[PDB]
Design a protein around this nucleic acid. Structure first.
Ligand SMILES: [Mg+2]
Ligand SMILES: [Mg+2]
Ligand SMILES: [Mg+2]
Ligand SMILES: [Mg+2]
Ligand SMILES: [Mg+2]
Ligand SMILES: [Mg+2]
Ligand SMILES: [Mg+2]
Ligand SMILES: [Mg+2]
Ligand SMILES: [Mg+2]
Ligand SMILES: [Mg+2]
Lengths: 185, 126, 57, 141
RNA sequence: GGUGACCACGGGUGACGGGGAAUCAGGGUUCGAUUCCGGAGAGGGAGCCUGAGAAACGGCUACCACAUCCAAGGAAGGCAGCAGGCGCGCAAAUUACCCACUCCCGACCCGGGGAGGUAGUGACGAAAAAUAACAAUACAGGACUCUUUCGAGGCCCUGUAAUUGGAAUGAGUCCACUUUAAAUCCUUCCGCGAGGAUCCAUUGGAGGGCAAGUCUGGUGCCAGCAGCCGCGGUAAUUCCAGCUCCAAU
């Protein structure tokens, strides 16, 4: 009987036509263009978008002025603006459909490390984020693919507790300092 | 110097004879805090002596900037040795329990049925 | 019919060779950088009638 | 043509019912035979004892000797030929040695050459040919 | 008299019934022994006490079917509770710790609970995600600018190397703390802990379907390859090898 959770479900879908070339030759760009961990990491975002677009498309079959459409719609749109994809109150649904992967990539943390100077080359970003150098707001974030809420864009910054940012120069500079004090001095 | 213990969600539990709230320990690069210090620093806080404060919970989260948890305060040690569970009194040298250890109990108590009611043999025991 | 003597004739007499060693190949995500880089942005020269990514000169 | 009517849900169901005992792929699956016939009693692989090593002559267009094993399965006592895949591996397997034999991929069809051999050897004395023919795990003794 | 091709009656099931699952343009198709609900059985049947409440199996009564000790007169046997073993088997965990959580029974705040929780085993499976980054060189290049071109200024670049170079970090290890019940695990952190020859990514492939070499060795209708199409008979794009590449990783 036990306590425990289950409800574990995949975050992704693998492609059917297993190596088209054309599909590979897109999905590689995406990996370089933005320094992605792996191929899957695309078809994560690929799977997540296809949800949205099918959620949206689910609504486009309904008649207008119907309690669901209006509610689920706003909720859904807000959720996109909230993370900074639809803009300004573009917020009327049909539009959702016209939208591509590039977007839920551009709002990953990794990208918005060098987009806001901070890093210096896209892979620094993914290193720097893993290396527990950068923080958001107050939490120190470990994860590259944390989609950044639009609000929480200006609060990405070098952690208070890291070498660049301040305090405790890392062990490499601490050792090559102690080589000058202990070894040389 | 840098700890700053701020509390949340204080309740005056008339009927368990207590004050109880979420401890929110800030702490910078220095690592966790022990429950002894936190008791003594929460003692002068509400002015009840360290003696009558029981703390568990304490869960830190990334960066090491902050650690939440639950602590709480009875109006006399006499009540604390009454409302409080064993583990929290035994946490610091005030009340301990036997070390028979579970399968010694079970092996014994499944005997003493074998014997009838001659106390001498039940006292025979293991 | 058939002689089962000839099981493992060929692996048997093929002269073995050393597998060498140079470069601990870069892996994970850096591999994929090296990959794109070396057939997208970098070289992308004047076309020479299709490529040959593992072909000869 | 078709029956098409509106209180015809049965003539239809019962039509599309029997006109499956004319499907081939279901009359394997739903009849009985298969479970009764395949030495592999509905089971992915099976263990059996190597009772001798037999070369099989491949089907005309490709001349060669295929190097298989007569097996007797434990669960049934049903006999088998299993082609020991990959070069010089028959050399490994000795008589009376316990092998884990799996299918070929055609599920009943014999594969390509190897006329009438559904099964392929995988393991040998708890080893796995893949480890032996790579030279990773040696023969046990 | 009642039922019947609106298919009864008969037979079968790799059938405990639902709630759901993976699949899926819409429609289905198979699976649901699977923690939630409902049913049944404690080797098999029958009968039993007792009980509100049971035809109760951690009761007993035989029988049948199993099986233990023996002083040979007799006696005690029921894991489809938890652990464990044997057999079966393609095919599945530790004689672990505990009532601290949720709950229950009791005369009961107080005992007990293999119900249950906690550890261990655990590529059943799902999530996140390291396996390096960067400056300057040496270069290897290619959009501005400059040059008829050759050349050069350089904002752009990128390839390999020298690793030139220090910076950054974690896998480890381990002061310390939390955790918890006591741990453990996690989260916190003192201290140590990266120049590859390391702290070392593998599995299949490389004719096509199908992304990837008529590169180089060896065999020569053998060995062997090949899910299908096929290759192998003396330059194999096909076998065994070497180097290179590709897919996922
Ligand atoms: Mg049967
Ligand atoms: Mg039994
Ligand atoms: Mg019953
Ligand atoms: Mg009974
Ligand atoms: Mg029992
Ligand atoms: Mg299994
Ligand atoms: Mg349990
Ligand atoms: Mg997984
Ligand atoms: Mg590694
Ligand atoms: Mg192919």
């Amino acid at each position: 009987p036990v306590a425990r959770s289950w409800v574990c479900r995949k975050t992704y879908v693998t492609p059917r036509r297993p190596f088209e070339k054309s599909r590979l030759d897109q999905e590689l760009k995406l990996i370089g263009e933005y320094g992605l961990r792996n191929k899957r990491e695309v078809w994560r975002v690929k799977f997540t978008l296809a949800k949205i677009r099918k959620a949206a498309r689910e609504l486009l079959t309904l008649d207008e002025k119907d309690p669901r459409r209006l509610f689920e719609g706003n909720a859904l749109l807000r959720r996109l603006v909230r993370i900074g994809v639809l803009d300004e109150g573009k917020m009327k649904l049909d539009y959702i459909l016209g939208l591509k992967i590039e977007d839920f990539l551009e709002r990953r943390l990794q990208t918005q490390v060098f987009k806001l100077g901070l890093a210096k080359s896209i892979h620094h970003a993914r290193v720097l984020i893993r290396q527990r150098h950068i923080r958001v707001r107050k939490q120190v974030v470990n994860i590259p693919s944390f989609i950044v809420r639009l609000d929480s864009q200006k609060h990405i910054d070098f952690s208070l507790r890291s070498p660049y940012g301040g305090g405790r120069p890392g062990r490499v500079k601490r050792k090559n300092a102690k080589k000058g004090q202990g070894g040389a001095g | 110097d840098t700890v700053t213990i701020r509390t949340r969600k204080f309740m005056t539990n008339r009927l368990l004879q207590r004050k109880q709230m979420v401890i929110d320990v800030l702490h910078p690069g220095k690592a966790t805090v022990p429950k002894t210090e936190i008791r003594e620093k929460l003692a002068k806080m509400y002015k009840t002596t360290p003696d009558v404060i029981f703390v568990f919970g304490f869960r830190t989260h990334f960066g090491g900037g902050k650690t939440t948890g639950f602590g709480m305060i009875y109006d006399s040690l006499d009540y604390a040795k009454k409302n409080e569970p064993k583990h929290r009194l035994a946490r610091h040298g005030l009340y301990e329990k036997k070390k028979t250890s579970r399968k010694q109990r079970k092996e014994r108590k499944n005997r003493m049925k074998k014997v009838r009611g001659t106390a001498k043999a039940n006292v025979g025991a293991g | 019919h058939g002689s089962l003597a000839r099981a493992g004739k060929v692996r048997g007499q093929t002269p073995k060779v050393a597998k060498q060693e140079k470069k601990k190949k870069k892996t994970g995500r850096a591999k994929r950088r090296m990959q794109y880089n070396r057939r997208f942005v970098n070289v992308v020269p004047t076309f020479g009638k299709k490529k040959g990514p593992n072909a000869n000169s | 043509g078709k029956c098409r009517g509106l209180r015809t849900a049965r003539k239809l169901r019962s039509h599309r019912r029997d006109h499956k005992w004319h499907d081939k792929q279901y009359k394997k699956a739903h009849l009985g035979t298969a479970l009764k016939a395949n030495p592999f009693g509905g089971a992915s692989h099976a263990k059996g004892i190597v009772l001798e090593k037999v070369g099989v002559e491949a089907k005309q267009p490709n001349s060669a000797i295929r190097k298989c094993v007569r097996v007797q399965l434990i669960k049934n006592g049903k006999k088998i030929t299993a082609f020991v895949p990959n070069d010089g591996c028959l050399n490994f397997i000795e008589e009376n040695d316990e092998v884990l034999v799996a299918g070929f991929g055609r599920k009943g069809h014999a594969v390509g050459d190897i006329p009438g051999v559904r099964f392929k050897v995988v393991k040998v004395a708890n080893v796995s040919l893949l480890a032996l023919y790579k030279g990773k795990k040696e023969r046990p003794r």
